[PDB]
Design a protein around this motif. Structure first.
Motif, PDB file in Angstrom:
ATOM      1  N   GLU A   1     -22.943  34.399  -4.019  1.00 44.53           N
ATOM      2  CA  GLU A   1     -21.942  34.302  -5.088  1.00 44.53           C
ATOM      3  C   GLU A   1     -22.497  33.605  -6.338  1.00 44.53           C
ATOM      4  N   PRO A   2     -23.506  32.755  -6.154  1.00 48.75           N
ATOM      5  CA  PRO A   2     -24.157  32.048  -7.262  1.00 48.75           C
ATOM      6  C   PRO A   2     -24.985  32.996  -8.130  1.00 48.75           C
ATOM      7  N   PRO A   3     -25.735  33.884  -7.481  1.00 45.92           N
ATOM      8  CA  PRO A   3     -26.505  34.913  -8.181  1.00 45.92           C
ATOM      9  C   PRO A   3     -25.592  35.970  -8.809  1.00 45.92           C
TER      10      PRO A   3
ATOM     11  N   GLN B   1     -23.306  38.390 -13.985  1.00 48.94           N
ATOM     12  CA  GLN B   1     -22.154  38.805 -14.795  1.00 48.94           C
ATOM     13  C   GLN B   1     -22.086  38.085 -16.145  1.00 48.94           C
ATOM     14  N   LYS B   2     -22.512  36.820 -16.172  1.00 47.01           N
ATOM     15  CA  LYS B   2     -22.509  36.015 -17.402  1.00 47.01           C
ATOM     16  C   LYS B   2     -23.393  36.611 -18.501  1.00 47.01           C
TER      17      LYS B   2
ATOM     18  N   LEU C   1     -31.778  33.324 -17.076  1.00 47.92           N
ATOM     19  CA  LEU C   1     -32.465  34.616 -17.003  1.00 47.92           C
ATOM     20  C   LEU C   1     -31.597  35.666 -16.312  1.00 47.92           C
ATOM     21  N   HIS C   2     -31.538  36.860 -16.901  1.00 47.85           N
ATOM     22  CA  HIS C   2     -30.777  37.981 -16.346  1.00 47.85           C
ATOM     23  C   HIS C   2     -31.717  38.977 -15.665  1.00 47.85           C
ATOM     24  N   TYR C   3     -31.185  39.715 -14.694  1.00 46.30           N
ATOM     25  CA  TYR C   3     -31.977  40.683 -13.926  1.00 46.30           C
ATOM     26  C   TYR C   3     -31.096  41.624 -13.104  1.00 46.30           C
TER      27      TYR C   3
END
Lengths: 328, 132, 93, 103, 32
Positions: free
Chosen positions: D53-55, D60-61, D65-67
């Motif tokens: 749930e943390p990842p 979504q934010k 860093l996004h991936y």
């Protein structure tokens, strides 16, 4: 001749001043657009060659003052020009204050604004609205700016301000993109519903109907109820609500269309009110065809309904052949 | 400030003692001489029943201001009566959040028992199949 | 509106108007104009309306309407052996 | 011979795809109303479902860093219908626990 | 804190879909 003389211009200054007196004489002939426009472009060109000579902006202001003395949108092109070199001069705001002095005095300068606002972006909002005080492409472009900034709702407002202007012609050109976009955004019923309501005053019906089905349904069917392709659609959506309506739809349909009423009637009685539907099949087959003869022959053959009614049917169709042949 | 019959600024205000309302003397006098009645409520009124506006008596007043003790006390009612409604906005919205939290934590507590069994069953199927 | 507005007085007058407004409707609610035309012809001359109404019925459910209007012994014998038969029974009987 | 019908249908199909993405984006984000913290996710682990749930929140934010952008609507509906089957007495146990958390 | 539960609620039902696949992959291998 002033241009060939300019090519001939060692006393170029003499030819130029002679071109100025020539302006003094030719001005009498002008009692204006391209004449005044070339007159200004050439005068400022003389102050431009003077600028190359370091001889110039002040005299350019003088000739521009003569342009003020000219006695109009092309003259606004002249103001746009004095402003153009004035900004090219290195005093951007100072010239804008002058064109503003003219418009405040009050339109031709606005084309220069589109020449200016296009790159003034690289806050700008009021700068843009100044145009609205005085061009749909420009509008969609500006809304696309705010969309790039993702002001979203503010952008929709712009489409509100456009459409109050251009009326049912250009407004459509705005409105098709405005619909496709705003529906794409929020995707509350009443607001968008109202928006189509405002909108309505052909494709609009289809967007709107597409909305209603997936966000009241019958209401949408009423809207479609409210051209052959349009008839075909409604029938499709009604079939989506279930079969029974579709046979019903055709009756509306009747008032090439007979091919479609036949297309609906085919599976109607063909899968089979059913007597009214079969008699309707007769009424339609008689309404206006050899394949249809194959159809009625199929309906007769289906029974394990009488050679007599069948021969009577072929007789009636033959009578139709008679009425058809009788036609000129 | 206004006369209720005409709508002008009355230059001689006289208040009636049947329907409490400030009328202009010259206007209301003619209304009484037409018929002995008060124009608003249509109750009986005579000219002697009407009374001019007067200075109270001997106690000196001052104009209605924010300083004045009674105006300051009615102010503090407005403060608290408005803040009491501010509490309802947070009491009513709390009863929706805690009601959605209660159903959310119940769906979490009903679901996480099924995550625990699938982590058992998918690993048990890998423990069973790999051994064969 | 002017064709329908032409008053139906008596039987032949209203039946004459039925020929006018039906042709007007034909050339230019297609079912409701046919229904109002059916009531005008049926509510008329009663002897001549059998040949007038039915003559524009095949052009205009069909089996039931024809049997009511046509309604003789020989006609039933001819039927048992569908628009042409009702026409034969209308002109003769 | 279709004309402005394929454009209307393409706008209708593009309208349908936007209705599927906005609804299936997130239940909490779409309904109504955080800073990026990889150290908070690292501290919370130091158990596996909490890290998942943390990842999901960090993806979504989008020190952040996004991936993650490949994890559709039909598989979630069957997952929701299955969990609903597994879940008077249930209404009182939720009202009592809500009063305990309120205290 | 209610909004933090909604993210975990919807994040968990994504994690069940992968766990159902690992069970579906296992039921195919057991049959073979």
């Amino acid at each position: 001749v002033d241009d060939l003389a300019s090519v001939w211009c060692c006393g170029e200054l003499e030819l130029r001043h002679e071109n100025y007196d020539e302006a003094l004489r030719l001005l009498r002939k002008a009692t204006l657009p391209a004449r005044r426009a070339e007159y200004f472009d050439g005068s400022e060109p003389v102050q431009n060659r003077v600028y190359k000579s370091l001889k110039w902006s002040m005299l350019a202001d003088l000739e521009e003052s003569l342009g003020t003395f000219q006695s109009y949108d092309r003259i606004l092109d002249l103001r746009i020009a004095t402003p153009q070199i004035v900004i090219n001069y290195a005093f951007l705001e100072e010239h804008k204050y002058f064109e503003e002095s003219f418009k405040a005095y009050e339109s031709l300068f606005k084309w220069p604004n589109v020449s200016d606002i296009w790159s003034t972006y690289l806050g700008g909002r009021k700068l843009e609205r100044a145009r609205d005080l005085f061009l749909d492409g420009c509008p969609p472009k500006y809304a696309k700016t705010l969309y790039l900034l993702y002001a979203q709702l503010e952008e929709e407002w712009g489409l509100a301000r456009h459409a109050m202007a251009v009326y049912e012609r250009a407004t459509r050109a705005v409105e098709p993109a405005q619909q496709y976009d705003m529906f794409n955004i929020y995707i509350a019923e009443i607001y968008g519903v109202t928006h189509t309501r405002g909108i309505y005053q052909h494709a609009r019906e289809m967007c709107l109907r597409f909305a209603d089905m997936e966000c009241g349904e019958i209401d949408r069917a009423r809207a479609i109820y409210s051209t052959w392709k349009d008839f075909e659609v409604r029938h499709g959506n009604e079939d989506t609500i279930k079969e029974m309506l579709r046979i019903r739809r055709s009756v509306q349909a009747t008032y090439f269309m007979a091919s479609q009423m036949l297309k609906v009637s085919g599976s109607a009685t063909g899968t089979v009110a059913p007597g009214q539907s079969g008699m309707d099949d007769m009424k339609l087959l008689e309404q206006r065809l050899a394949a249809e003869a194959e159809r009625d022959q199929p309906l007769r053959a289906q029974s394990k309904l009488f050679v007599r009614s069948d021969a009577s049917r072929e007789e009636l169709a033959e009578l139709a052949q008679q009425v058809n042949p009788e036609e000129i | 400030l206004i006369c209720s019959i005409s709508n002008e600024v009355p230059e001689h205000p006289c208040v009636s003692p049947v329907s409490n309302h400030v009328y202009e003397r010259r206007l209301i006098e003619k209304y009484i001489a037409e018929n002995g009645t008060d124009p608003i409520n249509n109750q009986p009124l005579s000219e002697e029943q009407l009374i001019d506006i007067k200075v109270a008596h001997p106690i000196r007043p001052k104009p209605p201001s924010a300083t004045s003790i009674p105006a300051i006390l009615k102010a503090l009612q407005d403060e608290w009566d408005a803040v009491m409604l501010h509490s309802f906005t947070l009491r009513q919205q709390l009863q929706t959040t805690r009601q959605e939290l209660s159903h959310a934590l119940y769906q979490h507590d009903a679901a996480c028992r099924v995550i625990a069994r699938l982590t058992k069953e998918v690993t048990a199927a890998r423990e069973a199949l790999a051994t064969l | 509106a002017n064709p329908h507005n032409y008053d139906a007085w008596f039987d032949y007058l209203r039946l004459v108007e039925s020929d006018a407004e039906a042709e007007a409707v034909r050339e230019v609610n297609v079912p409701p104009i046919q229904e109002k035309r059916h009531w005008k012809r049926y509510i008329y001359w009663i002897n001549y309306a059998l040949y007038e109404e039915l003559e524009a019925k095949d052009p205009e459910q069909a089996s039931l309407e024809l049997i009511p209007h046509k309604k003789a012994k020989m006609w039933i014998l001819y039927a048992q052996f569908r628009a042409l038969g009702t026409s034969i029974g209308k002109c003769p009987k | 011979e279709e004309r402005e019908i394929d454009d209307t249908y393409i706008e209708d199909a593009a309208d349908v795809d936007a209705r599927k993405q906005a609804i299936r984006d997130a239940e909490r984000v779409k309904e109504m109303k955080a800073v990026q913290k990889d150290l908070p996710r690292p501290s919370e682990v130091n158990l596996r479902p909490l890290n998942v749930e943390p990842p999901l929140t960090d993806l979504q934010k989008s020190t952040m860093l996004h991936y993650d952008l490949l994890h559709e609507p039909s598989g979630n509906k069957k997952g929701k219908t299955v969990g609903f089957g597994t879940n008077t007495y249930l209404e009182h146990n939720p009202y009592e626990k809500f009063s305990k958390e309120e205290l």
